[PDB]
Amino acid sequence: GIFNTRLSRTFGYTIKRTTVKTPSWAVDMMRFNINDFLPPGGGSNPRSVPFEYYRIRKVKVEFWPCSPITQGDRGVGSSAVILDDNFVTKATALTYDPYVNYSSRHTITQPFSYHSRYFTPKPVLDSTIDYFQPNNKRNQLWLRLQTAGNVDHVGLGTAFENSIYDQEYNIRVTMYVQFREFNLKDPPL
Amino acid sequence: GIFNTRLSRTFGYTIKRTTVKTPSWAVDMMRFNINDFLPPGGGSNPRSVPFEYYRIRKVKVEFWPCSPITQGDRGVGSSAVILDDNFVTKATALTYDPYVNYSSRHTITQPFSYHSRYFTPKPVLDSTIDYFQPNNKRNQLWLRLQTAGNVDHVGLGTAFENSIYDQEYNIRVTMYVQFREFNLKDPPL
Amino acid sequence: GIFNTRLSRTFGYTIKRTTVKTPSWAVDMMRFNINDFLPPGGGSNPRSVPFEYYRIRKVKVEFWPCSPITQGDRGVGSSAVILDDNFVTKATALTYDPYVNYSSRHTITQPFSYHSRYFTPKPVLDSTIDYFQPNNKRNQLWLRLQTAGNVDHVGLGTAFENSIYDQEYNIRVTMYVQFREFNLKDPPL
Amino acid sequence: GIFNTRLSRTFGYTIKRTTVKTPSWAVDMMRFNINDFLPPGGGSNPRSVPFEYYRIRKVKVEFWPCSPITQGDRGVGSSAVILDDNFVTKATALTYDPYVNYSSRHTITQPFSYHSRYFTPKPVLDSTIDYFQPNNKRNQLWLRLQTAGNVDHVGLGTAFENSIYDQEYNIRVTMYVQFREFNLKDPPL
Amino acid sequence: GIFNTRLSRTFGYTIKRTTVKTPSWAVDMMRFNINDFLPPGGGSNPRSVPFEYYRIRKVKVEFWPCSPITQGDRGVGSSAVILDDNFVTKATALTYDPYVNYSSRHTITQPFSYHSRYFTPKPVLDSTIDYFQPNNKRNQLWLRLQTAGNVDHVGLGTAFENSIYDQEYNIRVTMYVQFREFNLKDPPL
Amino acid sequence: GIFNTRLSRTFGYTIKRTTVKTPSWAVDMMRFNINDFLPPGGGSNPRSVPFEYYRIRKVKVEFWPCSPITQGDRGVGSSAVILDDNFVTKATALTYDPYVNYSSRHTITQPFSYHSRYFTPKPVLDSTIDYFQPNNKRNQLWLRLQTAGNVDHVGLGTAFENSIYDQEYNIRVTMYVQFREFNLKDPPL
């Protein structure tokens, strides 16, 4: 019983100002979990979408700027796809862009420019070995939609060039999911 | 955002015994409401299936017998489709089968025989005028999936021939519904 | 169980004389109900035509004159189709023909001339909102053939030019109806 | 004004037990009249189906058993079509099956088996001469739908083999009729 | 007598400022009535457009900004189509965008960006059941153009992200209507 | 914004009796103005049909008789088309039919006979020079729909033969007009 749908979530991210003169970059990570998109249900149905299995097909991360088009001290960054839960260490002012030479690098124009990334994440099945599957719609694993313990999906790391002014963003993540085995429970009343 | 699914519900019906010698029939009615198939949800989602609109496409009423194949004093009844909320009055021992000459009559062999009816019900929009639409999948009205006040659908009346022994049935109603406009609400936690 | 038939009814209408010199018109309305065409039945069958549902397809209103061809003070009127139960107010001597500029106006030659109107009426489902369906034989609503409370159908208003002499008419309304679900009841005797 | 419909009626028949050891048969007759299917009407319409003429096209006699499938002392009988109102004399325990060598004989398995007969009856126009028409849908006579004096149609005789146990049946006769000349009368009220 | 035309109306909407730091959204509703587009007439013609019936085909809601392109604290909202008169409750600062996961969601860039929505509304025939028709130009109901009591059409709800600065808009609604039955009345003078 | 419609108006005309023995004719004129067909509006809309420009395409003058078919002293007259506002002088008993040799003469049978004339009128732009356009639908001038000062259109003159009895007529003029530039004004309320 397949049901392809779309789930979204919005949150903020700010790159604080720095008095540093050099071009330094701010590094951060981004994971994706389905608990943040799918709330708990009620009653005999533990989740709000009554299905048993799921598998995330795609994610769309949108960096919607919060800064005016008149803001100066512009910069240039990079967003890369990291499917293994080993990101570059979080840094406030690093002397280089680590994600620049990555094959999945897209340039981030800053601060007042929109940046989208559309990709297929991978689940963290074993963080010790960090193995994942290649892209195959027919062979992608089905995970279970747990009650409160779903596994973290992974796949984006960023590097933003710091500035004299604060750079704020409203980040909207949209997960395109595919469920299976409609499992609604209908007790009497 | 269409989602065709199937919702079921099971309940009992008994035709009590009678010392009457004549062939008399027991008349009863059967309505269908979506509150009995779809429970209330939890939180910002008032219902367990997160959709706004619905329209019932078909219903399958199954009379599953509870009586052995050795039971005697067998009989013959009738099930008809009544799409207007004006049934023959409920009777315990009526001297005739009212639903026998109906164009939608199917014979009910009793007591140990299975009887199915598969049809398209109609909602009770105005009980004073009792108007309904003909069968058209493209023009069928969309109703709203209310929180606790959905409208009764209608469409089956029965007539069972009484017997010296009690005739029990387990009735399983299956509604084939079609929802629209996925409306999940995801507050923070 | 469809059965298309034809039901008729005859009654009188008179436009009384007036000493008024000007050309004035007499306005009146005309509704259609099935109780006036279908009498009550007898016994377990509440109506004389044993069916459950109905829908009026067409009506033919015939103004058969009662006046000789030698009658003078002739005039000219108008008949229009009013499908919403808001007619021009009934008037004895109005200074104009209100139904003259209506798109459904047919000229009434008076007094000794025959006038027919053949159209599809509409039922009064909600007199507050006054909504009706366009002409579609496949999508026309089925109403219930009530026992003594059927709903009024609507669709004709007239304007007759007054005269020194009385203008009498014998009005024959013929409704072309379509029934469904033969529901005869045959108790013993 | 043709209207083909279907009228039904249900009643009982029992073959009482006998201590006789031999195989004996119980003979009985079966006539069909329209008064038992069509009740009287009400008012100016003397009958409940408002038509003038009729002619019976077919009849379906169904012997629905009342006995369990575990009942022993089973037997074998015969049902024949007798279109002339001269049946074999009614007998309780006759030493042979009279209807066995008839060209229209169908075997009746007893007691817990269903038996149907579908045929075209004939009216009793003259019982002295006992003449009837062959089967022709285009040339079949139209009779009048009388008020309380309709003519008996004929066409089935049976022979049931007696048993130590009582053999009960619920007999459902269905007549497929064809009316003509819709004659509804609509007085005022 | 069909006459397709276009009626417009302009009014203001402001999202007041908030000291709240979080991303909160301001929710509001939008209904459409023809009294606000069609004024009352004069004399025997109760309305200024001399027709009897109407049906709204489309509506174009245009959010024309009032704010400069240099305004900061930009945001992102959502506009959805709600054809049933049950909107999300009006809120000043709600912690999420309720209309974000709706199938009819269009993103609203704020504050200095134009937003249009072009859709087919539905009338509020029964607010208790909240039923409406699907889109069909040939089967759309004709309503009556009442004098001062027309029914509210429905179909848009919004969610605007709050800001430190006031966000003003000039909203221009354009209804594309279709009238019927020219009913001009011409008394003497 | 073109809108072709039809506007009508009804009034009386009588040819009084004369004791004169000779055949004499009664001459009269007939002009057409849109103020007599289109009433004043209400509010910001000065007219009841909300358009700016107009041009009269055709006029249908119908002489509907008021006299019985038994009336004697019958006669013969003439109706001609006069597109320049210089009619034959109005006369009570003229010794000849002036409009008889006109190229646009149609015979008027009197008194109990219907007479129609269907033609294209012309406006009185300059009564001193009396110039008009030939018939061309594409090149016909657009006039302005004034508030209370519209220009007179012209085009019919008649000659009725007098009689011992009074000859009355009900004259119905129908103008087929074509408007342009829908100009409805919708202030608030």
Cβ atoms of D6 and D17 within 8 Å: the answer is no
Residue A99 Cα distances to A75, A78, A104, A115, A161, angstroms: 15, 6, 9, 15, 12
Give the burial class of B79: count Cβ atoms within 10 A of its Cβ; 0-12 exposed, 13-18 middle, 19 or more buried. buried
Q: Please name the residue that has the structure tokens 């679900």.
A: C181
Cβ atoms of A146 and A46 within 8 Å: the answer is no
Residue D99 Cα distances to B161, D80, D122, angstroms: 32, 6, 19
Separation of alpha carbons A147 and A153, rounded Å: 16
Separation of alpha carbons C53 and B131, rounded Å: 9
- In what helix (H) or strand (E) does residue F7 lie, and over which residues does it extend? strand F3-15
Cβ atoms of E67 and E15 within 8 Å: the answer is no
Q: By C-alpha distance, which of C36, C157, C174, C178 is closest to C108?
A: C157
Interface size, chain B vs chain C, as Cβ–Cβ contacts under 8 Å: 49
Separation of alpha carbons F83 and F117, rounded Å: 14
Q: By C-alpha distance, which of E67, E62, E75 is closest to E18?
A: E75
Separation of alpha carbons C8 and C171, rounded Å: 10
Separation of alpha carbons B15 and C165, rounded Å: 73
Separation of alpha carbons F50 and F184, rounded Å: 5
Separation of alpha carbons A35 and A42, rounded Å: 15
List the beta bridge partners of residue B132.
C142
- In what helix (H) or strand (E) does residue F168 lie, and over which residues does it extend? strand F167-182
Q: Please name the residue that has the structure tokens 């001193």.
A: F128
Cβ atoms of B99 and B79 within 8 Å: the answer is yes
3-state SS of chain C is CCEEEEEEEEEEEEECCCCCCCCCEEEEEEEECHHHCCCEEECCEEECCCEEEEEEEEEEEEEEECCCCCCCCCEEEEEECCCCCCCCCCEEEECCCHHHCCCCCEEEEECCCCEEEEECCEECCCCCCCCECCCCCCCCCEEECCCCCCCCEEEEEEEEECCCCCEEEEEEEEEEEEEEEECCCCCCC
CB distance A186–B38 less than 8 Å?
yes
- DSSP per position, F36-92: GTS-EEETTEEESS-EEEEEEEEEEEEEEE-S-TT--S-EEEEEE--TTS-PPPPEE
Separation of alpha carbons C82 and C88, rounded Å: 10
- Contact list, F5 vs chain E (CB under 8 Å): 1, 182
SS3 call for A110: strand
Query: Which subunits have 3 or more CB–CB pairs within 8 Å of chain E?
Result: A, B, C, F
Distance from the Cα of residue B180 to its chain's centroid: 23
- Residue F37: phi, psi to the nearest 5? -110, -30
Q: By C-alpha distance, which of A118, A149, A134, A104 is closest to A6?
A: A118
Q: Please name the residue that has the structure tokens 């009279």.
A: D98
The count of other CB atoms within 10 Å of the CB of residue B69 is 11
Cβ atoms of A89 and A18 within 8 Å: the answer is no
Separation of alpha carbons C174 and F58, rounded Å: 38
The count of other CB atoms within 10 Å of the CB of residue B153 is 21
SS3 call for B30: strand
CB distance E52–C84 less than 8 Å?
yes
CB distance B134–C142 less than 8 Å?
yes
Nearest chain B Cα distance for residue C146, angstroms: 8
SS3 call for E64: strand
CB distance A43–B38 less than 8 Å?
no
Extract the tokens encoding D112. 């817990």
Sign of the CA dihedral with E92 first, then E121, E5, and F33 last = negative
Q: By C-alpha distance, which of B93, B62, B108 is closest to B162?
A: B93
Q: How many helices (H) and strands (E) would you count in chain E? A: 0, 13
List the beta bridge partners of residue E25.
E94, E161
Q: By C-alpha distance, which of C45, C54, C34, C16 is closest to C140?
A: C54
Q: Resolution of the deposited coordinates, in angstroms?
A: 3.6
Nearest chain E Cα distance for residue F37, angstroms: 7
Cβ atoms of B67 and B111 within 8 Å: the answer is yes
CB distance D66–B74 less than 8 Å?
yes
- DSSP per position, A13-73: EEE------S--EEEEEEEE-GGGTS-EEETTEEESS-EEEEEEEEEEEEEEE-S-TT--S
Separation of alpha carbons E12 and E62, rounded Å: 11
Please tell me the total number of residues recorded for chain A in this structure.
189
CB distance E132–B151 less than 8 Å?
no
Q: By C-alpha distance, which of B167, B172, B160, B170 is closest to B79?
A: B160
- Residue E100: phi, psi to the nearest 5? -80, -40
- DSSP per position, chain D: --EEEEEEEEEEEEE------S--EEEEEEEE-GGGTS-EEETTEEESS-EEEEEEEEEEEEEEE-S-TT--S-EEEEEE--TTS-PPPPEEEESS-GGGS-TT-EEEEESS--EEEEE--EE-S-TTT---PPS-TTTPPPEE--SS-PPPEEEEEEEEE--SS-EEEEEEEEEEEEEEEE-------
List the beta bridge partners of residue D29.
D157
Task: Give the residue from chain B lying closest to C137, CA to CA.
Answer: B134
- Residue C74: phi, psi to the nearest 5? -65, 165
Q: By C-alpha distance, which of C168, C173, C156 is closest to C105?
A: C156
Give the strand pairing for C45-47 and C75-80: unpaired
Q: Please name the residue that has the structure tokens 């050891």.
A: D21
SS3 call for F102: coil
Separation of alpha carbons B171 and B167, rounded Å: 13
Separation of alpha carbons F79 and F85, rounded Å: 15
- Chain E positions touching chain F (beta carbons under 8 Å): 1, 3, 5, 7-9, 35, 37-45, 48-50, 182, 184-187, 189
Separation of alpha carbons C47 and E111, rounded Å: 67
List the beta bridge partners of residue E63.
E115, E171
Q: What angle do CA C173, C178, C182 make, to 5 degrees?
A: 125
Separation of alpha carbons F180 and D44, rounded Å: 62
**Is the bond preceding residue F121 a cis peptide, omega within 30 degrees?**
no
Nearest chain F Cα distance for residue E45, angstroms: 8
- Residue F25: phi, psi to the nearest 5? -120, 150
What's the DSSP call for residue B99? G
- Residue C100: phi, psi to the nearest 5? -80, -40
Give the burial class of E158: count Cβ atoms within 10 A of its Cβ; 0-12 exposed, 13-18 middle, 19 or more buried. buried
Residue E24 Cα distances to A103, B182, E65, E78, E158, angstroms: 37, 23, 20, 13, 13
Cβ atoms of D64 and D170 within 8 Å: the answer is yes
Separation of alpha carbons D58 and E150, rounded Å: 58
Nearest chain F Cα distance for residue E66, angstroms: 21
Separation of alpha carbons E61 and E76, rounded Å: 18
Q: Please name the residue that has the structure tokens 């639903």.
A: B99
- Contact list, A50 vs chain B (CB under 8 Å): 48-49
Residue A24 Cα distances to A82, A99, A161, angstroms: 21, 13, 6
Interface size, chain E vs chain F, as Cβ–Cβ contacts under 8 Å: 62
Among F7, F42, F185, the residue with its CB nearest the CB of E42 is: F42
Nearest chain A Cα distance for residue B3, angstroms: 8
- Chain C positions touching chain B (beta carbons under 8 Å): 1, 52-53, 123, 125, 138-139, 141-144, 146, 149, 151, 181-188
Give the strand pairing for D51-65 and B51-65: unpaired
Sign of the CA dihedral with E74 first, then E75, E80, and E85 last = negative
- Contact list, E48 vs chain F (CB under 8 Å): 41-43, 45, 50, 184
Separation of alpha carbons B61 and B115, rounded Å: 8
SS3 call for A154: strand
- Residue B36: phi, psi to the nearest 5? -75, -15
Separation of alpha carbons C34 and C174, rounded Å: 11
Separation of alpha carbons B6 and E176, rounded Å: 39
Cβ atoms of B18 and B24 within 8 Å: the answer is yes
Task: Give the residue from chain B lying closest to D7, CA to CA.
Answer: B101
Query: Which subunits have 3 or more CB–CB pairs within 8 Å of chain F?
Result: C, E
CB distance A45–B45 less than 8 Å?
no
- Residue D113: phi, psi to the nearest 5? -125, 145
Q: By C-alpha distance, which of F159, F26, F11 is closest to F82?
A: F159
Please tell me the total number of residues recorded for chain D in this structure.
189
Separation of alpha carbons B152 and B87, rounded Å: 14
Separation of alpha carbons B25 and B28, rounded Å: 10
CB distance A182–B9 less than 8 Å?
no
- Contact list, E50 vs chain F (CB under 8 Å): 48-49
- Residue B2: phi, psi to the nearest 5? -80, 145
Q: By C-alpha distance, which of F61, F78, F101 is closest to F161?
A: F78
Cβ atoms of A155 and A121 within 8 Å: the answer is yes
SS3 call for B129: coil
CB distance D170–B75 less than 8 Å?
yes
**Is the bond preceding residue B111 a cis peptide, omega within 30 degrees?**
yes
List the beta bridge partners of residue F170.
F12, F64
CB distance C102–E139 less than 8 Å?
no
Half-sphere CA count of C57, side-chain side, radius 13 A: 12
The contacts of residue E181 (CB under 8 Å, 6+ apart) are C102, C103, C104, E1, E51, E52, E53
